[PDB]
Design a protein around this ligand. Structure first.
Ligand SMILES: Nc1nc2c(ncn2[C@@H]2O[C@H](COP(=O)(O)OP(=O)(O)NP(=O)(O)O)[C@@H](O)[C@H]2O)c(=O)[nH]1
Ligand SMILES: Nc1nc2c(ncn2[C@@H]2O[C@H](COP(=O)(O)OP(=O)(O)NP(=O)(O)O)[C@@H](O)[C@H]2O)c(=O)[nH]1
Ligand SMILES: [Mg+2]
Ligand SMILES: [Mg+2]
Ligand SMILES: [Mg+2]
Ligand SMILES: [Mg+2]
Lengths: 482, 482
């Protein structure tokens, strides 16, 4: 039911508490982080973990234990990574952690660490064809994904803290460090246009880009980045000092490692010749959980199975017999109007998911429920949806039975967004479908003419007619009940 | 578990679906409305209900049945009011409704109708000392409330549709109708400074006031109105035509009845000499439900029992063992800082409820969870809370571990709001209490010096110290762990 995953990283030791709400439904119940930096001064002593950072990891792990127990978790899986697997005292740390708190750390290998990164990306992102990039403190993992399946894995022994402690602490030439980077980046035997940015270093870089570009959506999971347009600026971050990084929105804990990790990313992108990187909020923690939940399904969700959409329903509407019919009437109502709007048939995906969650906001309050639904969509419908998908679905629910202004920030957040006339049509269909599904109606059938839309049904539909004037129309048309 | 209440009004026939989540927890699961206006042309025929409006009520009620069944409701209570109880064909309508759908309408009397209005107001409003005013289509109910107890009841046979059909349809002098109003308003044997505005007519008038005053809170339930400051404008509404009412934000369907009902309100307020009216979103529908839920408790919630707060927890956090300790540490932390802030001891109510719901937003997403909590507070914490109470609690949770800007709209929505220095202190205490309650700590004790705040505990509190720099302080002070 409730599962905890501890990621003992080189720089960041994370924790994540997952809750299983269905066969495939799950949502992140809690998360935290700690900059213990277990690998502080170890890359000069041949991976010998000093006593100062190790005792910090003991106290952090000892309190991560209380958190996992505080949330009544029935499973706890601990994993270590580069800074621990490449340690001569590796077995010494796995013993003393049980001495204090009683946690059995399972050391992961570089090939197996890159596995989880691909498991999380091949199922929780709107694209299943890319190359993961987990730039961590000690190691940089990559993995090719092809239509959900992971092909090849590689684990470069290069990281943000590693490159920092031996190159950037000595103020060596920036191209001197870029040589050691290329020493391991050139052995990447795969190339792809897409890339999946994983790790706190890449997410910190994505926050800087969202800041200057004045991005309206406040979520980083799924943020598309033009690799060719932004590669120039990414290389510059290495040359900026502490103050200049502060103005760009870099956190305090991510100052000594951001510019070292920014160099590593600029080399990988140009090597892979990527043209589109996608920020990922999921990483090793989510990969460990998905491998268990999908052990009987080959580490892949079945077709048309989205974990965010499923988990969002189980939380706020476990009885969707009402919202299920609202969707089924949108599909019929759409093709029954295709001459007038001539809308691409790909937008049914957005209109269908909208009809399922348009009434989700009622769990908070029946007044402004569609406003509450759009808030839930824009902030929770994360896994498997791009920001454009969420923006469309958000606008469809928010402006139900209303007209969309011309200066909507979320409507103009991208150049690939549909036109307002297209959005008004989808919102109109959903508005009309909600009116026809309000009562316990049954087996309706529609038909169009030039401007007349006639609805055939053996039901009275008295209420559906009374609120018909309170309906925004995309173009002049007539709605008649026969 | 799920209960439906149908209110067959003179003008508006409403429906409300309630869900019982606890012994005293309940939230409005669904609501709707229909302008059937069963009393159209009956006040000229001595209450004879015409055939045109009655057959509309048959189709509306027949579909209200499907809604109640669609939501798996185990109880359905139907009540009629003035336009039906004063009808010669009253028994004829109660029979033909069973003929079509099978609903047993229970006709309520004027004294019993005013009862439910007081039951809803004496438990779901931030003041329990007032006089209810249910200005409906046919009758205007009033009821004195004293510290939760209802003293006297009266049922004036005056309404918005009644006064319209025989006075305002003839364009008689506005003071001619004001005489028939005074004929029944003078028999009000009670007076009080407070008033509780009930009904769609009074809520429509409250929406007009919130619009011109540019009210930032978008909820009408609990909107305080200065009776002496706004009585002048209320009388004017009768003199404005259709167009001018459109600009003021009046809903089309409330156009023929708003100006007739606006006259009725101006007479009652001046008679009662009220100085503060409080808009009420709850009415007859909520009174019927509360009389059942509180049948064994004398139609009153026990002390410190809020139905909105209880129902809000059961929905989004039925396991509050974590949030219950976050509150208990706020109370101790407050008095352990009283010399430095010298804050009124009445604000514990806001700080205590904040500590219980500050982590409520995690059910939506762990990222920006405090932002999600504030959204839930400002939009759902309705029953028993004034807009000032919600605004304070909303700001405490939203700006946790952050500083509050000087131009916050919700912070400057009233002249009685506390100062930002007071709000920063409360938000600081909550931020510190959340850090001390993160782990499964136990039995802490604090103490203050001039600027030193020393926290005594037998726990390590390693994580609580790491995130101490990320803490906004109201004034320069020192936090030490001993
Ligand atoms: N793994 C992951 N991290 C994220 C994502 N979005 C933001 N973060 C990171 O999560 C950290 C915390 O953000 P937030 O969760 O909003 O902190 P909070 O301390 O938890 N505040 P609150 O309790 O109000 O939710 C930030 O340092 C940010 O880098 C995401 O989608 N995935
Ligand atoms: N009884 C009551 N009515 C209210 C309250 N707040 C708004 N209303 C009324 O409820 C009616 C509908 O508002 P809304 O519920 O937002 O309509 P909706 O059609 O239900 N839209 P949505 O599905 O987005 O929630 C309006 O006509 C308004 O007058 C309230 O607190 N109590
Ligand atoms: Mg890692
Ligand atoms: Mg509603
Ligand atoms: Mg009434
Ligand atoms: Mg969080």
């Amino acid at each position: 039911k409730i599962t905890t995953v501890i990621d003992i990283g080189s720089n960041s030791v994370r924790l994540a508490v997952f809750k299983k709400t269905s066969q495939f439904g799950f949502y992140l119940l809690f998360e935290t982080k700690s900059k213990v930096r277990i690998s502080e001064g170890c890359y000069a002593f041949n991976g010998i973990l000093q006593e100062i950072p190790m005792q910090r990891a003991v106290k952090a792990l000892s309190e991560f234990k209380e958190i996992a127990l505080k949330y009544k978790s029935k499973k706890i899986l601990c994993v270590a990574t580069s800074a621990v697997r490449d340690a001569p005292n590796r077995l010494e740390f796995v013993a003393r952690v049980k001495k204090a708190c009683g946690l059995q750390i399972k050391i992961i290998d570089g090939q197996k660490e890159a596995l989880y990164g691909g498991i999380a990306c091949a199922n929780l992102l709107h694209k299943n064809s890319g190359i993961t990039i987990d730039i961590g403190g000690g190691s940089t993992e990559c993995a090719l994904i092809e239509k959900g399946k992971i092909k090849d894995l590689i684990s470069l022994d290069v990281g943000t803290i590693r490159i920092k402690e031996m190159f950037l602490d000595k103020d060596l030439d920036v191209k001197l460090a870029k040589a050691f980077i290329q020493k391991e980046v050139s052995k990447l035997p795969f190339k792809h246009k897409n890339a999946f940015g994983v790790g706190g270093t890449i997410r910190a870089l994505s926050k800087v880009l969202m800041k200057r570009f004045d991005y309206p959506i406040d979520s980083l999971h799924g943020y598309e980045i033009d690799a060719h347009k932004n590669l120039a600026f990414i290389e510059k971050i290495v040359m900026l000092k502490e103050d200049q990084l502060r103005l760009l929105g870099v956190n305090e804990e991510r100052l000594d490692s951001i510019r070292s990790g920014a160099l590593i990313l600029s080399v990988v992108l140009e090597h892979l010749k990527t043209s589109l990187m996608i920020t990922s909020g999921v990483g090793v923690r989510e990969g460990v959980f998905l491998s268990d939940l999908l052990r009987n399904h080959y580490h892949k969700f079945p077709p048309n199975i989205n974990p965010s959409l499923i988990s969002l329903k189980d939380r706020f509407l476990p009885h969707e017999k009402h919202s299920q019919k609202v969707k089924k009437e949108c599909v019929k109502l759409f093709e029954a109007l295709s001459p007038l709007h001539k809308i691409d048939e790909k937008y049914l995906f957005h209109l269908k998911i909208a009809g399922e969650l348009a009434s989700m906001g009622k769990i908070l309050s029946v007044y402004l429920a569609h406003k509450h639904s759009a808030y839930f969509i824009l902030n929770a419908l994360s896994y498997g949806f791009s920001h454009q998908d969420r923006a469309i679905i958000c606008l469809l629910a928010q402006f139900s039975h209303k007209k969309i202004p011309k200066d909507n920030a979320i409507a103009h957040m991208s150049a690939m967004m549909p036109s307002l006339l297209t959005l008004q049509w989808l919102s109109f269909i959903l508005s009309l479908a909600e009116n026809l599904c309000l009562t316990d109606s049954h087996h309706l059938k529609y038909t169009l003419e030039k401007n007349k839309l006639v609805i055939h049904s053996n039901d009275a539909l008295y209420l559906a007619k009374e609120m018909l004037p309170k309906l925004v129309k995309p173009i002049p048309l007539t709605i008649e009940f026969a």
